[PDB]
C-alpha cells in the first residue's frame, strides 16, 4: 500500500513551484472543484498539510495535463450506460447529481425533486427533467488508501485522516491473515501494487518449489517464475514471496500464483484479527494505552523480521593500500573466532 | 567494522565486490563488502499499535494468559481497549465494525419462516446465511446499515456447546480472571483488525555512561549508533535555574560535557570511592578567550582584590 499510494501522490512543492513558506491559507483548504479529482481526506498531518494530496480513484489525466473524471449520460430522466469523461470547466457548465439518488430498475428517476450539485459549490433540489449527468459510484471522491476503511462515513474527517495515514505505516508480519471486514478495494489494490506475481498466460503447474514455479502454456511452451526470498526492502523490512498453487492445478491468465509481503490469498492483509473488549481496567490502559495478552507473544501472532545492512570498503591510501585481513594487530583469538581465512 | 551499539541478530548474506574481478566500482576503492544481519523481533511494551479508524496507542502491559478476563465459554480476550476515548474523538465507526466482526466470526442464520423480516428486505440473498469466520465486505458510503446489523446481532449461531455468548445489544458477561467474581455489568466484546506500526521501542531505548568523545569539540558524540549522549537544551537550563538549583546546573555544564581534565578525575573518584572533586573550567570558555585574543582585545581574568590571574595551566 505504501508504494502504491506513493506512486500516485500529487505534490505542490518542488523546483519551479512555490516554496513551503510561500504557501498561505488559500492554497491549502479544499476547493469545491476537488470532488472527483483530488481526495480531500488523505493528507500528511505534519507541516506539509494541504500541499501534498492524493489522486482520486477514478481520475485520469487528459493529454494536456488537466484531470478528468467519469460521468454517466442522462438525457431526460433516463440513465444511459455510456460514460463520458469531463474536465473541471465542463463539470462547471452543466448540472450533476449524486450517484446514491434512488433510481428505478427500468432507468428512470422516482422522486420528482432530486439533489443536484451546481456551480460555485451550491447544492439544491431540482426537478428530474433537466439533470445532465449522474456520477458513477459513491466512492468517486476518495483516494485508494481511504477506500479501505470500513464504515468510513461514520467517522469524523479529522480521525479519518489519521486512519488513512496509518495504513501507510504498517509492518508486514511473519504469517498474515486477511481481514474479516474489508471494503473490496484491497483485492485490486494488491493485484495492481505489482508485488504479487500474477500468471501471464494460462496453463498447468509442472514443478512448484519454494524458489521457483514452472508452468507450461497450452501450446506447449514453458515458463519459470523466480521468487525473491528475504531481500531487504528500503525501510528494513523483509520482502518475501511464497507460492499458493500446487502441482497439477489448472490456472488461468491473470490469476495470482505467488503472494508477496502483506498479502494472503491475493488480498491486502496488514494486521490480525484480535478479540477485543471495551472497558477500563485497573489503570493499565489509562490515556490511550493498550493491554495485550501473553498469547500474542506465545503464538508469535505479531512478530516481524528486520534486516539491517552494513557496508565497508577498502580504498587506496597514499601510504599503501588497505586490505581485508584476518590478522588484526594484537587481538586475542577468542575475539577473532568467528571469522574465516578471508 | 563492528556491530553498532544496539544491533544484534544473525548474518544471512554477504556480498563481496572487487575491482580486479571486472566489477564496476567507484573510483579509489578496491573491495566493498556488504553484510546483512537479520533479527526476528517480537511485541512488547513501548511498541505502537493501531486500528483502521485512527485509534492509535502504545502497549502498556502484557498480562499472562490467565489474568485476562474471559467469556463464559472460557476463551480469554486478546486485548483490552479503553472507553473514555471513543465519545471525545467521535470515531464511533470502530464500534460498529467491532459488532459486525463478531457477526462475521460466529456466522449467522436469519430465520426465513413467515417470509423475510422487514429489515431483511433490501439485504441481498447472498448474506442470509454464512458459515463461521466467513469474510464479508462493506463498501464506503454504502453497505451495512444499522437496522441490518441490529438484526444480524440477534440471529447468530451458538458455539460448539449450544451457548450464545453475546446478547442482543452486542455486550457479553465477562468474568474477572484476576479475582474470580463476575463483572457486575455486561461489557462490549468483538473482533477487530489491528495492525502494528513501525515505531518500535528497541530502536529508541539507549543509554550511555562514558564512551567516545568528539575530537574537535571535546563533547560526546550524537545519535544512537555512535553511543552518544542526550542534548540539554536551553529550556532545561531555564527550568533548572527556576528551582534555585545551582550545583546541578554547574555540574551538568562543566564536568560532564567538556572539562577535559575533570571528567577523568570524576571517573577515578567514583570508581575509587572518594569525594567528587571540584569542577574545573570548560573548554568553551578557553576557546572564547582565544578567539577574543586573536582579535587584539586584551582580556584577562582578575581576582577578587585586583591581583591578576592566568588560566594558562
Amino acid at each position: 500500500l505504501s508504494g502504491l499510494t506513493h506512486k500516485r501522490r500529487l505534490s505542490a512543492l518542488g523546483p519551479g513551484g512555490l516554496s513551503r513558506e510561500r504557501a498561505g491559507l488559500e492554497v491549502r483548504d479544499v476547493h469545491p472543484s476537488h470532488y472527483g479529482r483530488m481526495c480531500p481526506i488523505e493528507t500528511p498531518e505534519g507541516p506539509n498539510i494541504g500541499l501534498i494530496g492524493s489522486l482520486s480513484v477514478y481520475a485520469r489525466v487528459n493529454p494536456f495535463g488537466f484531470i478528468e473524471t467519469p460521468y454517466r449520460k442522462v438525457v431526460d430522466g433516463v440513465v444511459s450506460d455510456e460514460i463520458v469523461y469531463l474536465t473541471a470547466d465542463e463539470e462547471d457548465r452543466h448540472v450533476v447529481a449524486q450517484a446514491n439518488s434512488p433510481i428505478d430498475a427500468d432507468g428512470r428517476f422516482v422522486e420528482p425533486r432530486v439533489l443536484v450539485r451546481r456551480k460555485a459549490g451550491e447544492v439544491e433540489y431540482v426537478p428530474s427533467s433537466e439533470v445532465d449527468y449522474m456520477d458513477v459510484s459513491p466512492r468517486q471522491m476518495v483516494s485508494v488508501a481511504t477506500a479501505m476503511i470500513p464504515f468510513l462515513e461514520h467517522d469524523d474527517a479529522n480521525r479519518a485522516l489519521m486512519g488513512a495515514n496509518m495504513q501507510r505505516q504498517a509492518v508486514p508480519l511473519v504469517r498474515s491473515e486477511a481481514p474479516l471486514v474489508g471494503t473490496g478495494m484491497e483485492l485490486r489494490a494488491a493485484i495492481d501494487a505489482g508485488d504479487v506475481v500474477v500468471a501471464e498466460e494460462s496453463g498447468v503447474i509442472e514443478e512448484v518449489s519454494a524458489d521457483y514455479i514452472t508452468v507450461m502454456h497450452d501450446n506447449g511452451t514453458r515458463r519459470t517464475y523466480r521468487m525473491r526470498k528475504f531481500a531487504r526492502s528500503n525501510h528494513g523490512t523483509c520482502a518475501n514471496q511464497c507460492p499458493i498453487v500446487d502441482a497439477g492445478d489448472r490456472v488461468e491468465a491473470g490469476q495470482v500464483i505467488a503472494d508477496g509481503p502483506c498479502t494472503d490469498d491475493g488480498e491486502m492483509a496488514l494486521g490480525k484479527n484480535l478479540l477485543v473488549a471495551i472497558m477500563p481496567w485497573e489503570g493499565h490502559n489509562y490515556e490511550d494505552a493498550i493491554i495485550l495478552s501473553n498469547r500474542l507473544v506465545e503464538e508469535d501472532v505479531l512478530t516481524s523480521i528486520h534486516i539491517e545492512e552494513h557496508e565497508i570498503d577498502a580504498r587506496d591510501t597514499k601510504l599503501g593500500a588497505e586490505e581485508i585481513t584476518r590478522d588484526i594487530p594484537n587481538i586475542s583469538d577468542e575475539v577473532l573466532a568467528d571469522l574465516d581465512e578471508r | 567494522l563492528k556491530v553498532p551499539h544496539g544491533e544484534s541478530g544473525k548474518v544471512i548474506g554477504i556480498r563481496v565486490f572487487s575491482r580486479e574481478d571486472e566489477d564496476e566500482l567507484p573510483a579509489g576503492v578496491n573491495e566493498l563488502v556488504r553484510v546483512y544481519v537479520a533479527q526476528k523481533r517480537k511485541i512488547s511494551d513501548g511498541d505502537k499499535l493501531a486500528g483502521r479508524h485512527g485509534n492509535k496507542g502504545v502497549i502498556g502491559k502484557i498480562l499472562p494468559v490467565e489474568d485476562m478476563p474471559f467469556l463464559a465459554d472460557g476463551t480469554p480476550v486478546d486485548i483490552i481497549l479503553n472507553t473514555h476515548g471513543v465519545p471525545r474523538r467521535m470515531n464511533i465507526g470502530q464500534i460498529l465494525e467491532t459488532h459486525l466482526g463478531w457477526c462475521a466470526h460466529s456466522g449467522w442464520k436469519v430465520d426465513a419462516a413467515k417470509g423475510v423480516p422487514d429489515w431483511a428486505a433490501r439485504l441481498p440473498d447472498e448474506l442470509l446465511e454464512a458459515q463461521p469466520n466467513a469474510i464479508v465486505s462493506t463498501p464506503v458510503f454504502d453497505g451495512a446499515q444499522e437496522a441490518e446489523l441490529q438484526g444480524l446481532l440477534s440471529c447468530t449461531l451458538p458455539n460448539r456447546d449450544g451457548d450464545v455468548l453475546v446478547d442482543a445489544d452486542g455486550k457479553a458477561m465477562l468474568f474477572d480472571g484476576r479475582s474470580g467474581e463476575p463483572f457486575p455489568y455486561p461489557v462490549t466484546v468483538g473482533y477487530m483488525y489491528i495492525m502494528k506500526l513501525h515505531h518500535l521501542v528497541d530502536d529508541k531505548i539507549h543509554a550511555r555512561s562514558t564512551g567516545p568523545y568528539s575530537m574537535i569539540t571535546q563533547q560526546p558524540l550524537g545519535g544512537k549508533a555512535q553511543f552518544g549522549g542526550q542534548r540539554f537544551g536551553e529550556m532545561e537550563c531555564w527550568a533548572m535555574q527556576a528551582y534555585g538549583a545551582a550545583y546541578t546546573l554547574q555540574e551538568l555544564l562543566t564536568i560532564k560535557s567538556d572539562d577535559t581534565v575533570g571528567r577523568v578525575k570524576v571517573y577515578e573518584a567514583i570508581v575509587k570511592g572518594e569525594n567528587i572533586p571540584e569542577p574545573g573550567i570548560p573548554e568553551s570558555f578557553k576557546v572564547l578567550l582565544k578567539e577574543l585574543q586573536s582579535l587584539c582585545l586584551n582580556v584577562e581574568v582578575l581576582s577578587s582584590d585586583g591581583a591578576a590571574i592566568e588560566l594558562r595551566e
Partner: peptide, 26 residues
C-alpha cells in the same frame, strides 16, 4: 459474480448493484 480477478476468494458484500465500469488500471 462481481469479481473480475479469476480464482479470488468469494467475499459477499452489502451493496446496491453498481457496475458501469470497474476501477481502472491504478
Amino acid at each position: 459474480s462481481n469479481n473480475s480477478v479469476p480464482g479470488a476468494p468469494n467475499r459477499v458484500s452489502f451493496a446496491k448493484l453498481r457496475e458501469p465500469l470497474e476501477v481502472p488500471g491504478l
